[PDB]
Each structure stands twice: as structure tokens, then as C-alpha cells.
């Protein structure tokens, strides 16, 4: 749709120095999308943008901790 | 980096650093002038045997000495805030790099495309190679493309640190649980140094930052070779 | 201000003694620690 | 109950040079000594505890 | 002989004993937290209690029994008490600031929502509303006590003050019971931290104000107060209104708005 | 009557100045302090790589 | 807002006693009924070992170090879940 | 408010008061030297004659010293004021500080 | 002999003050001029001159040949 | 004459050029001849001798204006003593260097500094004004 | 009452200048030496 | 609704508090709670300064609203003058049984 | 008699003298810590150990100079001695509670010296930020002892502040309005209102830190939904007002000392000086986040804190120009106290102006956490609060003691200290602009020259501090007793003689209304 992805674009929802919620919201959006896909039988490739953005923005250790907690059943955000 | 006997700021490597130097020059003249005026007026009040010790009326003179300072402050604040809103303006980065502070070293993550990350530690003084700078060099430099807008995102995995590079005008604190953003754009290739800038325990003096600014195609091949 | 002459004048020699003892009281204990630092550290 | 404030007024105003904290009589002296002995004793004890805690235990 | 109206106080050991009790309580909390021992702390709590008792005893001796509280002395003590309440209001403001900072911007660890994921707040219409009625009622009954005292009515002063103290105690027992029953604890992240530290300092101040009203109750039983001179009672009524207003802000902020 | 300053002022000024200059020059030049001045106009650059 | 109540023209103790028994204590009695009515145990929620809860960065200075000060076995799980 | 002439006239009248007392003489000179001026000859003349009515020769001399002092480094002011006072100095037999050696340090 | 002329006697401190505050202002202007010229303007011109024909690839090549970089030999 | 500590609440004498007429006379007790001179002062001052006028002045006042305003040599003592103690400080610093400081790092050895200087020039440290700007990359020497 | 006057409104004696010098030396001297001995203590420990 | 049992200050104030309440009832001010009103301050009509000893400090606010107060000891004897404005004060010593 | 007089005091002079002795002793501790700092930095490499021991020393230096030297001397020592005498009051309103403010300080100091003795000390900086100050990176008792030391010092000053406010409002002569009290009394009242409102906020923040370290709360721990940055706001909501608390009583002493040695009856523009101190006290509560310009706050918040911080230059400038207008036309007496006050006027102005530089957030990005901040605040603290303290101590020492200092020695002491503090701090501006960070035990080699000079400066100031102890000994050894003092009609604190009797104003002054 919009390949040649370089990095995450400016997002007017998160215009300030603190970008923590940008990473978090994209991580959520990705995982929500992926659940909505696969579930309804459709294709996870439509969630790809959120995946690229959270990968770009989020520290590896945050992603890794959140992934562990989703596996353990202790992820506190709603997916 | 700083050089011996240096008096002022490191030379500007970025346009926003250039702006800060001219705004510092403007502000320092003011500082110079007010301090000199005060020292001079002091010597003027103290160098005569003539006296006038009876009550003196204050209202006229207090207007001058409120209004002129107010005007001088507005003449500092106008360019100060222009620069503040400039750094904040939207600029479209081509790359995002994260750095995480640790006790006591920085790690870097370049994860726009591949999973590239590594640790960056001070070279111990007994291992410096001849010509290298004590407490400043690192084993793995933060290689970046010159002449491009880069988003740096800064955090910490333990205590506070702060990620600074004076010649680019940069200092962003590294706070665990928070992701702070800044932008970086070097006008020139080369090696640009900084040092951890928030007290963080036994080796705070010894976890420096070295950026290595090179043409895009060199940065890409270096990125690929670091996987 | 005006004041009376000293009730117990402190001559130049007595001032030399007070000054020296006062400087030694700061210099000697700190000097002893800093002289022995290498002993404390590479202990 | 009856109002015996006038009796306390005479007691506390008696011209015996006693400071107010001991003017009630010998029970004030006792409670004063008990308080000051626990404070000074506890303070020596807190110093002992600093000396103890100032060195590793290992 | 002085010919001003102010009180030159006799030399006193209680400032030194109270200062040493503070050293003993703090070095005691240190030994409790880090060296597994309650000894210093119990000695400091004891000396602190002995110090307050004798110091305020002596202020009663100086005033009711010796007559040193002229109007200029009382007016100082009014300022003193007002300023002390102001400093306690600022101390609570730092905890309210902590509460709003964390709840207005809940971080990802909490689930990015308030109350955090996994927290089940108390229902504010149950025991917390009951506690609100209890402290508001006790601000009505102390005001009755105050007017009976000014009107010279000993029996209704004592009756209204007893009611006011009984409501303070009821709030303190209802709170102790809600702490026991609460399914979250002080270790339940910033929700349990702000909840228990802010309501817990408030409960301590309810215990302090109730103690102070009990002191006034026994002085009243001993006839110390006149219908025009009773600053200890006014101070404890101002401190009691302070504790009720802090509760109202906690109820609205933490129990209600933060549920 | 001349006071302390009339009798000793000149000597105190002369000797304190001589002593101050002498001991600062010595401390600054004779005991191995590394002031780390600028290399500019002073150091000949040497091959490092 | 006057409230809906309504007086002055004299003053004092008698009015505040009227307010204490006519309005304030009735309100307490009412809230006390309301409360002691929604009282008695509610079903404890499934235990989930969420990492932002049951914090332990240093043992508590009492008990076994792992119980909160007014721990209620019925409704306060430990970091490893409700007690046996 | 007032002209220089009115300022001077009020001071002349202050010191010309026949039964001026010692306290008023000191109050007047110690207030006057607080101003940013050296007092005109006619003010000093009236203060010197007040000294005479109060039989105080020393304070006449001290008044002349304080005129010189209020001139600061304007060394032309004092010799001009003494020149203008000479008839009064001669009439009252007031010696100047210099004629008494009281200018010597 | 000749009389001495009457000198100014009044407002001497105020006059000295007026004269020197104006002096101090004039100096501040003449310093501001020199400071704009020796420091600020000089800096603007050093940066404008440096970048006018600056070739960043050529600067990079010199650094690279001097062996300074990790990423480029 | 003799000022006492227990006279603090009484008007007192002071020499200062801005309070020329102090609240009491310098000398209030008079000898037989000094009483006769105060009587003589009630008559024409032209009949007082110069010594009598100076004696009246010194009864009323302690020091003249020229005495009380005189300059002193105190500055020599202050500046000289301050330089002494500044000089003494350099003794402490010599002692510290000799007995407290060890060798500084090897990066300050002359050959290290030469090499580091070339490497700073090779990376064009501060090439606009501060450092490399002062090096002539064409003549390979420091700019004049 | 208490003593009043120069040298009497202080908790230390100034009756003898030398004994005063000793006490002042112990007093200021102990405050200045303490952080060196604490540093020595922190180095010795480990 | 009401009854008695609370002592009044008249019955129970004591010590200095009682002295002050009893003097105020007589219009008197032995403990200096009120500011004295100035006379015209001339030598015929000086401000009269009570004292229990032989001297008392006066502060003179020479004109209304001056922020500077002029302080001096006033001694028993002849009226003295404020050294800034000259208004006259005279000490009237004695007793504390005024 | 001794214990009744000196441990059980209810007397404002004696308790003032206790605070002066305690503050002088603290000052020798803070001076030793400052020389350990400058010995570590005085040549390249490591002298003492790594940054732990070094920042234990830096952290204790600041707490001792602020809480145990400057606040006790200015407010406990000069405030207790002078305020009651300057309003004709017989003592403070709460003379017994006043003695507890004093006695809580030796235990607060003991806790701070315990913190440095146990474990590895609290190497946190005087701001005590978490998580470095929390129970994982600073495990064990040191930081809790520092928290408790701050609680005791906080209670001592909060009760002090209640006492000064009450005394100043309630115990003036009935004719004196607050606009007839001297400027030093206004400066203590304002400073005490700042203490009353700011200390309880620090007490709340450091209590939160205590419970995060010992009760498993998570106010500042993101794992529980907390935020380290919240601690910074609570701390600096107190810490900005605190620097105005450290300077305001200095401004009040400077106004008295300048007026007195200019031979004037009053300071120029009295109601302007009052307005200026209340405006600075008020503005000092709405600017705290200028200590947090690199923490990642929003741009409009950084624009508001830049502007509100700058505005404080207006009322501050009124005071500097009014001190100049007070010298104007004076009969200048070049006493050693006057020299300290003239040094204050100029060197405070220098450090206020570098503060103005730093108020600019965009520039503060590069100056923050470098020695440029260290230079700013030591010009207003070592060459402002300290110069006002040494000016007031040599000025009023003959009132408190009844004995005179030798003025020649005091001028020599002023000259050595002036050279030593400028040699020490002036070069730190260069270190900061060129990028040397704060809280470092060692620096890259390029920073050597200015650190060496700064360390040589600190030793010259050590020689001045040693000579000061001798000068005080000399005055008590020679016993030259005061006879008369100039200008008592406008300096009421001298009018009861030197030293004043134990009870003064037993009969109050007479002041009529008219
Ligand atoms: C006495 C102590 C004191 C005082 C009075 C001040 C006064 C001020 N300070 Fe300072 N400051 C400190 C002690 C003090 N400071 C300390 C301890 C720190 C660091 C804390 C830490 O991190 O540990 C600090 C840190 C600090 C910072 C944070 C910098 C950083 O960490 O990056 C800033 C930022 O704005 C600041 C600004 C100011 C300003 C604008 C003033 C102003 O109030 C100064 C106003 C005065 C003047 C401007 C001079 C007089 C005026 C005139 C002659 C009129 C003409 C002037 C103009 C037109 C400008 N200071
Ligand atoms: C109506 C309640 C009144 C309180 C009664 C309880 C005892 C302590 C009293 C003090 C209360 C003040 C607040 C101190 C902080 C914590 C206590 C908060 C209130 C409370 O009691 O919280 C309890 C935890 O107590 C705990 O940790 C207890 C830890 C107890 C140790 C206290 C720690 C010391 C605090 C130091 C205070 C310093 C203040 C300085 C003053 C500032 C100077 C200007 C809650 O229990 P929980 O099991 O976690 O959850 C309930 C589960 N069913
Ligand atoms: C950002 C930087 C800003 C820097 C601003 C600096 C401001 C400089 C201002 C200059 C003010 C000029 C005033 C000159 C005063 C000096 C002494 C003097 O000259 O004394 C008198 C001035 O006093 C008067 O009243 C007139 C006024 C009242 C008394 C005099 C005091 C005013 C002096 C203020 C001095 C300030 C000095 C330092 C400031 C930095 C002169 O006497 P007059 O003829 O008026 O008598 C007439 C009598 N009447 C009143 C009854 C009519
Ligand atoms: C769990 C417990 C441990 C924690 C410690 C705290 C414990 C509880 C203490 C409760 C407080 C009791 C106060 C009793 C004071 C009695 C003395 C008194 O009330 O004294 C009155 C003066 O008021 C005065 O000093 C007013 C005195 C003001 C008292 C201040 C009270 C609040 C202090 C509380 C400390 C707060 C801790 C903050 C915690 C974060 C006496 O003057 P009158 O009443 O006019 O009488 C005179 C008439 O008789 C003449 O006709
Ligand atoms: C004037 C009167 C005031 C002065 C009072 C002086 C009192 C001195 C007695 C202190 O000794 C005791 O020692 C206990 C046992 O030796 C300690 O228990 C501690 O000792 C062990 C090590 O932690 C553990 O077994 C315990 O649980 C732990 O609490 C604890 O510190 C204290 O009770
Ligand atoms: Cu990492 Cu400082
Ligand atoms: Cu600030
Ligand atoms: Mg920082
Ligand atoms: Na070092
Ligand atoms: Zn007057």
C-alpha cells in the first residue's frame, strides 16, 4: 500500500517529546488487529503497518516483556 | 569534542546548534553589559566625598529600573522562544534509532528494518590505542548517516541517565518506563562525542557516547555487517 | 564603632602562636589522611 | 464533679521558685527523670547501633 | 517586672526531649526497616508520648492555672495554629499531586487505564459514603459543642463533644475495617500506594484530632474552660474541620472520581 | 604616634608580594604540574594510525 | 444554595443541637443502614499474577516479609496466589 | 516646590532666631549638611551669629570645617565662602580652622 | 588683589551623577558595537564562510583516508 | 575624657563629618583655668588668644575634620598580608602534589599528545573556529 | 540570675585565651577533620 | 435546651490575664496593649511617657506613614526632643501601682 | 545553671548563639567536603575512588552547606538574635518551641553523618532522585538515614517558620504597622512563609521515596504505574523556593549593612524593597520545572517556565539598583562588613545573570547538568549567601559578643576569600560551556587546565576559612570591649548595649500613633 517504509511517520496524536504512548498504542493496535484477523479467518498481512511502527519505536526489552506477559496471561492492556 | 583551554561552546555540528551559538552570543553581550554597568555604577557611588544623606524620592527612578529590565528580558525571550519552537517543528525523520541507558554503558537499537542492536562501552584507559581520547572513546560507535534527519528515542533499563552530544546541541534524559524523543541532523561527517549527563552511580563519569557520521551507503553496509 | 583598648592584649607573638595552632588544627588531621590514602585504598 | 481550678491556681502560683515543669510536686520530678533517662539512654543506644551498623557483618 | 503582655516561658527540658525522641523514632524506623529490630523505635515512641504529655500539661499549667495567656498571647497561639494547619494542608497536597499525576496519565504497566487492570475499587456509596456522613455529622456536633461552651452550658458542651469524639472513633473503626476488607493492598502498584498512603495519613490525623478532642473533653470535665477563654477547644475544632475537609477531598478524588 | 601600618606597612606589602610571586611561580613551573595548555602553535602533530 | 432548611434572628447552641439530632445523626443512621445491607463478602476474582501488583522490591519488616500489614487471607492473594 | 532663594531664606531665618537654643543650633547644622549643596554664605553667617549668641566659639569653627568638607574635591568653594564671610569673621573674632592649625592632620 | 568669583555650590553630587550615567550609557553603546563586531558578527561570518563552498563528501574522503572511521576504510 | 560601658543609654560623643555638632561636648569637667576660659568666651572672641581658641575647640571636640578624615597606610598591610596568605596557599598545593597526587595518566605523555593532536586534526575537531580551524591543511602547519 | 556582659553570654569560657584556643581548635578542627576520617572509613571498609 | 456550669473569666481568670482584664475595665493600660495617642508635642505640651524605671526607649514615627522609625532613650528629667523631627517627649516614672 | 541556660533555653539570644555555633561547625564540615571534591578534580585521574565515594562527598557537601550552615546561621542565628530586638519584642512568640527547632538540628546532622558511615553512603546528589536513590541501586540504610535527616531539618524549620511569622505579625509595638518594620524583619517573615508552604511538599515527596524503598509502594517505580519524574516535580516544587529561602535573609542583611555603612538613616525605596521580596517569594513558587528542561516535558510548558523564570529578574533588579541608590551620596565607611556587601552586590548580580542564561530552555538543553549550572549557583551561594553571612557576622559580632574584631585582619580575610572563590568558580563557566558534566569524579583531558585552576582557588578559600577562625579567636583573646556605636536611632538592635542584657524590652518601647 505504502512500501519503501523508511521509519515511523510523525503522528499528530503523539506530537511531544514523550513517545511512550506511541509505541504502546501501535503495539496494542498490532496485536488487536492480528486477533481480529486470524480469528475471522482473514489475513494478518493487513496488520503490517502497526507492526512496522511499533518495531521501529519500541525498545526491544518492552516488546519482549509485553510478549512474555501476553503468553503468561498477565498483559494488562486489552487485546 | 572539547579541546584544551576551551572557553565557549564546542563548534556547531548541526543547524540548531548554530542557532544556539548566535543566541548565546546575543545573551552574553547582555550579561556582559549589565554586569559591567553594575560594577561601574558601584565604583561611581563609591568614589566621591560629596554626600546627600537626607531622604530620596524613589518613584521616578523605579519606573526606569523596572521598564528597562522588562524590555531587555523581552529582547532575550523573543529569539529564545523562536529557537524553542524551531526545534519542536515537525521534520520527517528518515531513520529511528533507540538508545537505552544502563549502569554503565549505552545500548543502541536500529530496528526500522532488521534487528540490529549492540552495547557501547568506554575504552579503558590501559587499552586506548595511541591518539585515542581518555574517557571518551567507545568500543562500538553509533554509526549514523550524515545530512539526514534522524529520530533518536532514549530510555533506560535501570536508573536515570542522560544522553548528550554537545556539538549537536543534544541532551535528552534516559528514564526507565519512558521513551523520550529528540532529533539529530549532522551537517558534516566525523566523530561527535558526549557523556552521560545524569548521576547514575559508580561509573557515571565513564559511559560516553560517540557518533560516527558517514554517507548513507557506508551506513547501510555497516548496518548490514552488524547483524 | 569605638571600643576600649584590649583588657588582655594579644601581642604579635601570641597572634603568631594562635594563628599557627589554628592552621595546624585544620592541616594536620586532613594531611595525615590524605598522606595515607594509598595505604587505605591499595590496602 | 466540682470545680477545683482555684486550688490548682494556688498550687501553681506558690512562690517557691520551681519551674513550671516541676511545680506540681514530686511526681513531676519522677516523670522528668524517667523521660530524660530514656532519652539520654536511648541516644547512647542509638550511637551504639551506628557504630555497629558502620561496619560490615560478614 | 515586665510591663508588656507576652509570656516569658520558664526554661524547659521538653524541647530537648522532643528533639531526642525524634532522633530515636527515626533511627528506630531505620533499625526496624534494616536490622530487624523494634527496640529503638519503641523507646522513641515512648519518649515522644512523654514529651508531648508534659509539654502540653505545662501549657495548661501556664494558662488555666497561672494566668499567662493574656489576649496578646492567645492571639499568637491563634496564628500559630492557623499556620500549622496550613503546613499540614501543603503536606496533603503533595499526596494529592501524586494521586492525580498517576491517575490522569496511567502508564502501560497499569494497562494504560485507571483504575489499573486487576484493581477493584471499593464502592464509594457504601462504607466510604458512610464515613463521609460520619465526619460531616461530627463537624455539626462540634459546632453545637462550641456554642454551648460560649453560652456557658457545661452539660450540653460535654454531650456534644462526646458525640463528636464517638463519631471520630466510629470513622477510625470503619476505616480499620475497610482496610482489612479491601481486596487491594499498599503493594498493589501506584493505585494501592496512593490509596493507602493518602487515606492512611488522613486516618492518623483523625486519630490525632480525636485525641485532641479527648484532651478537651477531660479539661472541660475539670472546668478549665471559661465561656470566653478556651483556645485549646477552638484549636482542636479548627484541626477537626481540617481533617473533615481533607476527607471530603479524598472522598471526591480517590474514592469517587478515581473509581 | 605612627601606628602598625606606618612602621611596617611597606615591609608587609613588599615581602608578601615577593613571597606570593616566588612560591606561585615555583608551584606552577617546578613541581611537575601538567597544565595541559592548547596544542595550537605548540605541538607538532605526529602519525598515530 | 440555602439548602432547603431555613433560619436566624438570635443564636446558637439550640440550633446546632437541632441540626445534630434532626439532620446529621439521621443521615449517619441512614448511611449506616445503606452500608449494613450491601455488606458481607463478594466473590473473590480469579487470581492473575499481574506484574504491576503484589509488588515486592524488599521484604516487609514484619511476619515472613511477604504479607501486607493488614493482609486478609480471604481477598489478598500473595505474589504466588491466594493462600492454601 | 521651592526656589533656591526660598530654601536659603528659610535657613537664614532658622539660625537668625534670637533665642535659638544649643539643641536647635546642632539640629539645624546636622540636618543642613545632609543636603546636596554647600550652604550659601548668608546661611553660614546666620549660623555663626547663632554661635555667638550661644557663647560657643568652637562650634563656629566646626561650622567652617563642615563647609569645607561638604565641597568635596571642589577646592574653589571654601576659599570663596571664607572670602564672603571675612567681615563677619572679623566682626565676631572667629578664627578659621586654618588660622588655628586645625587643618593639619 | 581680586575677589574670587562665586562657584556653583548646589547639586554637586546630582551633577556628577547625571554626567557619569550618560558616560556609562555611551560606553555601553560603544561596547555593544565592538561586541557585535568582534564576537557575534565574526561568528556568523566564520560559519557562513566555512559552509559557502563546503564539500561534505570531500571532507568525508579525507577523514576516511586518514583511517578515522569504524565503518569506512 | 573616659567613656564607660554602663553609659550606653546616654547621649554620647562621635566624630564624623556628616554629624559635625555631636550631642555632648568632648570634655565636660573643667579645671579652674578651663572654667575661667569658658567665662572669657562669653566676652568678645577677638580678645581670646589663638591658644585659648584652640583650647575651647579641643574642650568641645575630640578630633578636627582634618584628623578624623585622614588617610592611613592600612592598605599596605591588608594587600601585603593577603598576598602572604595567598603565597602560603601555594605551599599547601606543593605539599598536595608531592605527597597526595600520584602520576597523571599516560595520555598526557608528549608523544601521546602529538598523536592525539594529529588525530583531532584528522577528524577536523572544531573545524569552524575552535581547533582545526587554526591548522593550515595546505601548508601542514599551525596558521600564523 | 545568669551572668550578663561580654564573655558571659556564651556557653564556652573566654577567661583564659589559651584554654580558649584549645577548645576552639578542638571545636572547628573536629568539624573540618570529620569528612576526611569518614572517607578513610569508607576506603578501609572496602 | 440549655443550663449553666461553665465558669466565666470574672470568676476564674487569674495572674496576668486577670490584671489585664481588670485594668481594661477601668480604662487603664499598665501592660501597654494600646498605642498611646500623641499630644501636639511642643515643649509646653510634651508626649508623656510612662515608665516603671528611670529611662524608656521611644520610637518616633515623625510623619504619618514614614517607614523609618527613630529610636532613642528618654530619661527622667527635662523633656527631650526627637533627633529627626524635634517633637518633645517627657518621662513620667513610676511604681506599676499606677 | 549551665544545663538550664544552654540545653533548656527559652531565650531568643542564647538560642540565636547556639544556631551560630552549630552553623559555624557545619561550615567547617561543608568546607572539608568542598576541598575533597576539588582534590579529586584537581588533577586528571582518580584520587579517592570511583563516583560512589565521590558523590557521597558531593551530596553531603550540599546538604551540610544548605541545611546545616546557611539556614541555621541566617534564620536560626541572625533571625533569632535580631528580629525580636528590631521590633522591640521581649522574645519570640513561642520561646520554648524555638529551642526545639534548634535541638532537632544536631540529631538531623547525626543522621546525615550516619548515612555516610553505613554501607557505601548515599551517593545520590542532594536532589536524591530515584531510581538511583531507590532500594535496588541504593540498597541498605544510607538513603533512609538521609531522608530522616531531611525530615528532622524540615520539622525544625517548619516550626521555626511558624514562630517567626507569628512573632513578626503579633509582637510589634501596637503603633508599628508592618510597613514600619525594618527590611531584615520583612526578609525573615517572607522566607518563613516560603519554608511553611514548601517544606511540607518535600516531606511528602521524600516520604513517598521512603515507602517506595521500605513498604513496597511504587510512587516513582514504573513497574507499579509510578513515575520517577513525579519525584522531581515534588522535590523541585520545594527546591526552587528553597534557593530563595537561602538568599532572602541575605538580601535583608545586605540592605541593613549597605544603609548603615553609607551613613544613611534608611535604605533607598523601602516599599519597593518590600514589594521586590514579596514578588520574588511569590514567583519563586511557579517556576520549579526549570530544573527539568531535559526530562522530556511539552514545548509550551518549557516556553511558560522559561518566561516565568526570567520575570524574577525585574523585582531582583529593583533591589540591586536600590542598594546602589542607597550607597549614592553616602558618607561611605569602608568597614570590612561593607566590603562583604559590595562583593555581594556585584557577584550576586553575575550569578543572577548566568541564572537568566539558564532560564532559556533551548540553551539549557546544552548547559543542563554541566558545570555552567555549578558556576551559576556558587556565584549566588558562595559569593551571595556566604558574603551576606560574613558581612552580617563581622557587622553584628560586636553586638552579640560585646568585643570588637580587628578590622585589618577582617579586611585581609575578605581579600583572600574574594580571590579564592572567584579563582574557584569563574573557570567553571568555561568547563560548563565546553560540556563538562556535573557529578563526575574525573574528566576528559581537555578539561584539565580549568579544573586545576578551580582546585587551586578552593585552597585559597580554605586559607581564608582557617584565618577566619583565628580572627574570631583573636577578638575573644584580646577583649576590646565596645563603647559607642553610630546610627542607633535607626538600628534599634544596638540600643540596649553590647551585648544586650539577657532580658531586653521588659518594658516595651513607647511609640505613639498621632
Ligand atoms: C541563592 C541561591 C540561588 C539563587 C538566588 C538563584 C537565582 C536564580 N537562578 Fe538558580 N540555582 C541555584 C541557586 C540559586 N539560584 C542552585 C543551587 C541551582 C542548582 C540546583 C541543582 O541542580 O542542584 C540552581 C539552578 C538553576 C537553574 C536550573 C539550571 C539547570 O539545572 O540546568 C535555573 C534555570 O532557570 C536557575 C535560574 C536562576 C534565576 C533566573 C535566578 C534569579 O533569581 C536571579 C535573578 C537575579 C538577577 C537577574 C541579577 C540582578 C538583576 C539586575 C542587575 C537587573 C538587570 C537584569 C536583567 C535585565 C536580566 N538556577
Ligand atoms: C486509619 C489508619 C492509620 C494508620 C495505622 C497503621 C500503622 C501505621 C501508621 C501510620 C499511617 C501513615 C502513613 C504511613 C504509610 C503507610 C501506612 C498507610 C496506612 C496503612 O495502614 O496501610 C496499610 C499498610 O500499612 C503498612 O504498610 C504499615 C507500615 C507501618 C509503618 C509506618 C511507616 C513509617 C512512616 C514514616 C512517616 C514519616 C512522616 C514524616 C512527617 C513529615 C515531617 C515534616 C494497608 O494494609 P495493606 O495490608 O497493605 O492493605 C489492606 C489489605 N486488606
Ligand atoms: C537597567 C538599568 C537601569 C539603570 C537606571 C539608573 C537611573 C539613574 C537616575 C538618575 C536620577 C537623578 C537624580 C539626581 C540625584 C542625586 C543627588 C541630588 O542632586 O540631590 C537633589 C535631588 O533630589 C530630588 O529631590 C530628586 C529625587 C529625590 C532625591 C535624589 C535621589 C534620586 C537619586 C537616585 C540615584 C540612583 C543612583 C544609582 C542608580 C543605579 C537636588 O536638590 P533639589 O534642587 O531638587 O532641591 C529642591 C527642594 N524641593 C524638593 C523642596 C523643591
Ligand atoms: C497516634 C499518636 C502519635 C502521633 C503524635 C500525635 C498524637 C496526638 C496528639 C494530640 C494533640 C493534643 C493537643 C493537646 C494540647 C493541650 C494544651 C492546650 O490546649 O493549651 C491551650 C493553648 O492551646 C495550645 O497551646 C494549642 C496547642 C496546639 C496543639 C497542636 C495539636 C496538633 C499536633 C499534632 C502533631 C501532628 C503530627 C503530623 C503528622 C504528619 C491552653 O489555653 P486554653 O485552652 O485557652 O486554656 C486557658 C483557659 O483555661 C484560661 O481560662
Ligand atoms: C535508659 C534505657 C534506654 C536504653 C535502652 C538500651 C536497650 C539495649 C538492648 C538491645 O538489645 C537487643 O538485642 C536483641 C537480641 O540480641 C536484638 O534483636 C535482634 O537480634 C538478632 C539479629 O537481628 C535477631 O535474633 C533478632 O530478631 C533481632 O531483632 C535487638 O536489637 C535488641 O532487642
Ligand atoms: Cu549513566 Cu550517568
Ligand atoms: Cu530553581
Ligand atoms: Mg539532569
Ligand atoms: Na579525579
Ligand atoms: Zn520624630
Author numbering:
A (entry chain H): 7 to 85
B (entry chain B): 1 to 227
C (entry chain M): 1 to 43
D (entry chain J): 1 to 58
E (entry chain C): 3 to 261
F (entry chain K): 6 to 54
G (entry chain G): 1 to 84
H (entry chain E): 5 to 109
Manuscript text:
5 is the terminal oxidase of cellular respiration that reduces O2 to water, coupled with a proton-pumping process. The third proton-conducting pathway, the H-pathway, extends for proton pumping from the N-side surface to the P-side surface.
The refinement assuming two conformations with the same procedures as used for the analysis of the 20 mm azide structure provides two structures at 0.7/0.3 occupancy ratio. The dominant (0.7) and minor (0.3) structures are closely similar to those of structures A and B, observed at 20 mm azide, respectively (i.e. the nonshifted structure essentially identical to that of the resting oxidized CcO and the azide-induced shifted structure, respectively). Similarly, the helix X structure near Ser382 at 2 mm azide indicates coexistence of conformers A and B in a ratio of 0.8/0.2 as given in Table 5. Thus, the results suggest that the two azide ions terminally bound to Fea3 and CuB in the presence of 2 mm azide provide the two structures in both heme a3 and helix X as the two terminally-bound azide ions do at 20 mm. The present results giving a binding mode ratio of 7 (bridging):3 (terminal) at 2 mm azide indicate that the Kd value of the second step of the azide binding (formation of the two-azide–bound form from the one-azide–bound form) is 4.6 mm.
